[PDB]
Structures are given as structure tokens and as C-alpha cells.
Amino acid sequence: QVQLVQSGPEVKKPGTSVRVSCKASGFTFTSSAVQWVRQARGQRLEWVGWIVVGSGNTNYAQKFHERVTITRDMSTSTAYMELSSLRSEDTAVYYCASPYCSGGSCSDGFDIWGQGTMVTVSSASTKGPSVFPLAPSSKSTSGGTAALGCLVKDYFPEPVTVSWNSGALTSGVHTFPAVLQSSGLYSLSSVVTVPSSSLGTQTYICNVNHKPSNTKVDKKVEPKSC
Amino acid sequence: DIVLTQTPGTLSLSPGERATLSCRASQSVSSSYLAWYQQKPGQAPRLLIYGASSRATGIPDRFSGSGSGTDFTLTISRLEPEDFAVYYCQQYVGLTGWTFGQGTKVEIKRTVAAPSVFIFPPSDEQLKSGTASVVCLLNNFYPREAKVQWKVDNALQSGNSQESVTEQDSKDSTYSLSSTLTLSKADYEKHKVYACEVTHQGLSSPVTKSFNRGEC
């Protein structure tokens, strides 16, 4: 199929450099171009620069012209963005995009997009989450519905994966976006609403995985009788 | 550099309705260098319109673009469920200096739905570790606007809570929200009554969920 495939997530200390790759398949990359655009969570798209694949001719945005390099390897149909002297404000998802080309003919605009690469820039050090139960009780039982969950607290970096009952429980799950705390660590809750009558006959276990800290936690959430 | 300003910030519309999205440029932009993109949560942008009015390959007829100079419009003649997304304009004048608008979110308008409200005291396990998180959950409400206030022994709290909200649900068009009050174990043990007070259009008066520390 026609696609751009980007390299995996990056976690970098301030002052370092990051290199993100963008692999083209299913179209005539030699006729094409690659732009780089970034997006911080809940913020607008920001243009970094672009390269024409044939010539290798580059053009960078004012903000990045002293610390970005865009390159391509035509033999591997790959483009790269190298961003140096990283700062916390560089934390964003970075996207590559190309005009579709078939032989010499190309789309006017950038219609093929990579899946994005998460880049975190922080002074914070790798830390595994503390996983605490949010136990169902009379205070979390509304009509015939109970709420229960797991608090996944004080981890770095993103992401954590949270499943319920090894992926068997998906309906009614809310895994909230992580909040960055003043400490530089992340915290989130994963909750599920269930029929209150299920609490006696169905076990609820939150499965928390944090690969960077080698953390695997399976927390059984026990109902309270009060 | 050229600044693009989009209006409105959020459009709340029923499926089947017409959507009109505005993009104003701080400087005169030629119609040849204005694009529109669609973006859904956790997805890359999708090109809709190039050169102000040209549909990208395979883009449906219901998407159209108009304008030039400092004023551009994207129209969606009849909103389909798959059209609820954020929309960005972009100017690409010259070889550099390309900029995007801040985006317009086109959100599904549904009937008012009051949240169900749930409160969770700190776990015994967390208190042992020296911190106390009190969690207030709002389940499956509409619209998005909700006021969640923390009261500790009837005192309004400030600067010690954080909210997190889900994306609008693809099937029931509701939101869910967590509010977390974070205290030192010491500060938690000084007070008795912990209350989450929820104000929402679906509630004729605010709903309070509360507990006495150590009772359950």
C-alpha cells in the first residue's frame, strides 16, 4: 500500500539530538518531497521544514534553521529529521508527509502522512509507576452501576499500557490521558463502570505495563462492603 | 511570519447540518497557497483542500473551499459522523515560513446528559507510601463544560487538583472526566470530610459525593 512509516518513540535529556526516520513504500519516492510537522498535545501543528527527494534541496523554518537537518537516502526511500540542542518545548509528536507520486506525476499537496513519532524532552529519569486500587464502595455506586479503577502514579516516561482482565474487559473502560506533575513524573487513572451486581461474581484486575522501568503490575481491585 | 487565526474555536453541530469554518490571515495570502486538513485524535492530518478550492484526490463532494487574500472558508455541506474532527488551515507561501491555524474542533451535538458521579478515598496502600490521591469520576456526560470543585471540611480547594477528560465517545457522543485532589499523607490526616461538588447543565442543582476519612 501507499504509506510513510516513522521510527519509534524517543525520550531525550535537554541539550541532546534526536533523529526520526520516515520510510516510503508503494509510491515513486524519487519524484516526491518530505516535510516535517510537529504537534504538542492540545496545541496547533508547527512546520519544521522540507526536502525535495530528487535534488536533496532543503528549506527550514526560522525557529529550526540553526539546529535541524533534513536528509534522504534514495536507495532506501527514507527521509530523516535530526533536531539538535533539544529543549522541553520540543516535546511533541513529529509527522513526516509527502505528495503521492506515480512515476513523474505527483499530487499538488502533502496527501501521504506518517503515523507520527512521540519525542519527549525532559530532565526526568526513568521511574516505574505505583499502582493503587480505586475500590468500588457505596460512594462509587450510582443506581445499579459501580465504578472501580487503578491509579497509575508517578512514572516516567510515557507511555503506560493499561488493560482490564488481560484485555477481556473493554466496554465502559476510561483510561484518562496522563497529567504531567510538577515533579516531572506522569499520573493517570484507568476506571471502568460495571453492573454493581457483578462485584460478587466477576474479578476485576488492571494490567499495567511500563517497558522503560521493566514494571509489570496485575492489581486485583477488591470491592468494599461499606 | 504570516499568522492564521481560525474561528470559531469549537463548532457543536448535529449530524446532517452544514459546517462553515473561517481562516483569517494576518497578511494577504494568494488562493494558490492555502490548504485545509482534517485531524482525528491519535491520527495524522488528512489533506482535504489545496489552492483554497481544489479537492485532494478522493475527497468527497460535501467538502469545499472558498476565498483569497486574508479570508478563507471551508464548508462541509452535510456533516457525516466521520466528519467530526479538528480542521486546520495552512498557508505555504514560498519555499519556507509555512504556518497553520490553531484549528476548529467540529464536535457532535447530542442531548444534554447529566454525569454519574463517583468518589474514591485514598487506598491504604498509597497512604503507606506517604501521599493521598482523592479521585472524583464523572461518567458519560454532555456537554463537555463541567465545574468540579473540591471541599475539605467545607473549605474550597485551589491549586491541589488536576482534571483529565476523554475524547468524545464515537458511539454515544459523551465525555468522561477525572478530577484528582493530591495531598501529603500529613495534610490528608488533618481533615475529616472530603467532597467533590459537580455543576453541569444536566443537573438542576450541583451533585456532591463525599466521605469521612477512615470510615470505608
Numbering used by the authors:
A (entry chain H): 1 to 226
B (entry chain L): 1 to 216
Sentences from the paper on this structure:
Severe acute respiratory syndrome coronavirus 2 (SARS-CoV-2) infection is initiated by the trimeric spike protein that decorates the virus and binds the ACE2 receptor. SARS-CoV-2 infection is initiated upon attachment of the viral transmembrane spike (S) glycoprotein via a receptor-binding motif (RBM) to angiotensin-converting enzyme 2 (ACE2), leading to membrane fusion and entry into host cells. As for all coronaviruses, SARS-CoV-2 S is the main target of neutralizing antibodies (Abs) and a focus of vaccine design and therapeutic targeting efforts. Two mAbs, S2E12 and S2M11, stood out for their high neutralization activity against authentic SARS-CoV-2 virus and two different SARS-CoV-2 S pseudotyped viruses [using either murine leukemia virus (MLV) or vesicular stomatitis virus (VSV) backbones].
The S2E12 heavy chain uses VH1-58*01, D2-15*01, and JH3*02 genes, whereas S2M11 derives from VH1-2*02, D3-3*01, and JH4*02 genes. The heavy-chain variable gene nucleotide sequence germline identity is 96.53% for S2M11 and 97.6% for S2E12, showing a low level of somatic hypermutation for these two mAbs. The concave S2E12 paratope recognizes the convex RBM tip through electrostatic and van der Waals interactions. Specifically, S2E12 utilizes the heavy-chain complementary-determining regions (CDRs) 1 to 3 and the light-chain CDR1 and CDR3, respectively, accounting for two-thirds and one-third of the paratope buried surface area, to recognize residues 455 to 458 and 473 to 493 of the SARS-CoV-2 RBD. Nearly all the S2E12 contacts with the RBD are mediated by germline-encoded residues with only one out of five heavy-chain (G109) and one out of four light-chain (G94) mutated residues contributing to the paratope.
